[PDB]
Amino acid sequence: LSQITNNIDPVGRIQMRTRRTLRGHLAKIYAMHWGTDSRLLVSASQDGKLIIWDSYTTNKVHAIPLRSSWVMTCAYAPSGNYVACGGLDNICSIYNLKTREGNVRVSRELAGHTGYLSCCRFLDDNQIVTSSGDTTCALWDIETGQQTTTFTGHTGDVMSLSLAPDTRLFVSGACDASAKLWDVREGMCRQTFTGHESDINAICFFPNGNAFATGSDDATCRLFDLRADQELMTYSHDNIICGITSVSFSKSGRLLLAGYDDFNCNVWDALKADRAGVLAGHDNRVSCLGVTDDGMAVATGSWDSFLKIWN
């Protein structure tokens, strides 16, 4: 990609200031998800709690206590009614938000896996995809509680998963050095993209839902294209050997993000692969970083219980 498009200009160094510092957690912030109103972000920590934050004014709107402190994912509903959280206890619990009583309660404690639940997203308010430790992606209905389609096909463990924005199809990144493009309706694989040396610790989808970037542990982000079935861009450089732990595109697709085990977020130009920014606010592993859907902010949670919101 970058060998073709180097005729255009680069956007220079992007200076991102720590606009907010959402303190409050007591352990490692393992995953976060932005809302769809660009204002409430849920983030889950391995001390038990998942906190729904008001990002505009640094306020903890909700603090949901789990039955199992081990959580490894979260997802905020597009309609804002539900919030999912799964983990090592294999039960991707769906909690409610717009309750008449007004206290967060467990709407469902869905089960059906024999591995840990790695990463879950919401298709609609009544359908959830979860990626698991027993190597099978899963698409669940919250009401009946049963797995609508359990996508088998991964040989090794599958560590993350991300939706295309049109909620019709998704991509699951696994430890077999390959991301598989699943589909909701047909229930089977469309394409299986390889090209990695090692595992895939996190994945995300570029706005058009015609691309996605895999976050490996060899510090090599790889933008893939769906229809061609080949690796498109190899975001990599020397002096970064640590593991990628979340990827996040921007609203325009120009500015990809990454969060490393090098203790600092790396902001990559998606067209020229240069490290166009460094977000070194933390002192430990950047587990999760998200870009809100309107494209205004960037929030980032890391293993030091700090959620820094960088504009």
Added chain:
Amino acid sequence: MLVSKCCEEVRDYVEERSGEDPLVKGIPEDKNPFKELKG
């Protein structure tokens, strides 16, 4: 499927959308919702 054509498609799409991007362009701090809010 002619990888040059699809990465060119990615390029023209992102060049179409890179104008009104609220992150790579920047903020004027009044249209920004994330002012530092001394209070």
Added chain:
Amino acid sequence: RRPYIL
């Protein structure tokens, strides 16, 4: 001749 400084 007592000191005053403490």
Added chain:
Amino acid sequence: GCTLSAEDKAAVERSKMIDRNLREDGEKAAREVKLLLLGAGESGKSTIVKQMKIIEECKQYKAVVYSNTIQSIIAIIRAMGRLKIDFGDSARADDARQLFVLAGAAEEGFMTAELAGVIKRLWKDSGVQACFNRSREYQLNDSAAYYLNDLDRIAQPNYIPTQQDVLRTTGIVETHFTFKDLHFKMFDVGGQRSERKKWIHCFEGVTAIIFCVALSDYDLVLMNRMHESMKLFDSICNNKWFTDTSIILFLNKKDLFEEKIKKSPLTICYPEYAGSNTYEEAAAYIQCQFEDLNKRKDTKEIYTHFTCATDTKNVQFVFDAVTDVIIKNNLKDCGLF
């Protein structure tokens, strides 16, 4: 402070409320003591955990119990239409209708006398039972019978769910055993099977790994199984996340090892061993065989113990070891050393 139309303050005060409860649980997040378990073989891990376990929350699950019960009976009734099973007594048709009316108008799981009566009568009906017995033909909660058979108790106005009720609503098996006034945790992790590399840094910050090893697995061959436990102890004791955390080392089934070392020698397990074929020298040699695997001797320290499926001085020993891993850990942060 401009108070911002007297609702934002409320939101801000909401956060302070959150903070209070959050900080309190953070206090108990320090107070409870964590303990990972890992055994390559079966190792008497069930024997260990039953040796340790021998020495308002439920209310939160009430509407879940109700929900599950409503879901179960609806599943059966609906299946009757699909499988063309008639009610035993045609009168149950009115009750079936009423079920859907009552579930249909409610916000979430609930129970009233009226609903309890409708579900009770449906569940006792012979057609409903015949459909129930064909449940493999549709999708039905495992706990359907458990709740429906106990409906009378569950429907009482002051119903409080029991532990079993909650359990009825295959990975980490948490164990909240308490010992000597002090509250612990214990994670029986080895039940679930996945890539051990990915989720092990979730267990960073545990205060003591309990690495239970079977002793009599020195001769079962798939590759010897004791060498597989040696490789597991290598990849757990030389991991970058457990550099500062010690490892308790339980060697279990010692009487089975006594009779099997009285029958077969140990040289089948180790070619480079030529000591005496006694109990204590073999035990000390295999203990020093495990403790030699510590590549990071300065920071952590493998403690050792032997037992059979007896010897209830096991449990307090963990306390001993937890003391000898709390104390030393405080010596690495309290300004000393």
Added chain:
Amino acid sequence: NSDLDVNTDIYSKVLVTAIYLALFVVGTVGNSVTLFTLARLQSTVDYYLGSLALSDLLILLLAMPVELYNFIWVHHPWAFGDAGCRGYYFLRDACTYATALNVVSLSVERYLAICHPFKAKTLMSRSRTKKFISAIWLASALLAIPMLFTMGLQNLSGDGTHPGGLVCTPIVDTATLKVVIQVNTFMSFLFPMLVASILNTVIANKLTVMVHQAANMTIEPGRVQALRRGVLVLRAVVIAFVVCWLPYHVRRLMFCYISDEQWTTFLFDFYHYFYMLTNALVYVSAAINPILYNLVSANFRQVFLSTLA
């Protein structure tokens, strides 16, 4: 005309003030770098470390330059004023009480963290610990308000009217002065002394019976050897506390206990030279609390040369 001016010669004076200035610069730079480092999980000991560091920085930067400015060179006609002297001795007594109580509660936190560690997991929390930090600061202020209730100005010229004969002295009578400085020495030296010494001997005893008896391999005697370096960083703090805050309090109580019948001219000179010696030892303690926390542990040595360079 300027009587009550002691003849202290300039060579010993400039030696003492050179010792003072070197003590001041190394102490304020050490307390500055350790306060910024602790401003840079069971972290309930870093607050006691930073509080003792802030107390030492405060006593140094508030007393010591004003001390050389109006206590060794500029004698009894001073220039700080009434509120200056009263607030100065208020801050001095408050910082002494704060350093004493910091040694007390740091040793108490160490004793709970080793010899009864489950009671430290149950009892000690970061919130409570910040509450205790505010509590010992408020206890220092509440026990330093009698220093505001006892100080004042007094003219001691030939008629008590000359503006070159007024001193800033304790203006209360001898008996109440005795009482306030006797309870000052009693609490703020002796109860820290016995508490810190008893708990540090018990902690060192528990560590020595943990590494000698060992209830396992000692790890080729490497980590337990640096644990005996931790015995050194225990015993060095307690001996530094007693050997620095002993003679200052002895000098305070020898100011109280003599009522001009035991004073001579040479004992007046010896009292003033001993005052320079004891405040030298107080600034010694103010310098070598962060120096003792820095130099003897090589990790602090490396990270503070990284902070410096």
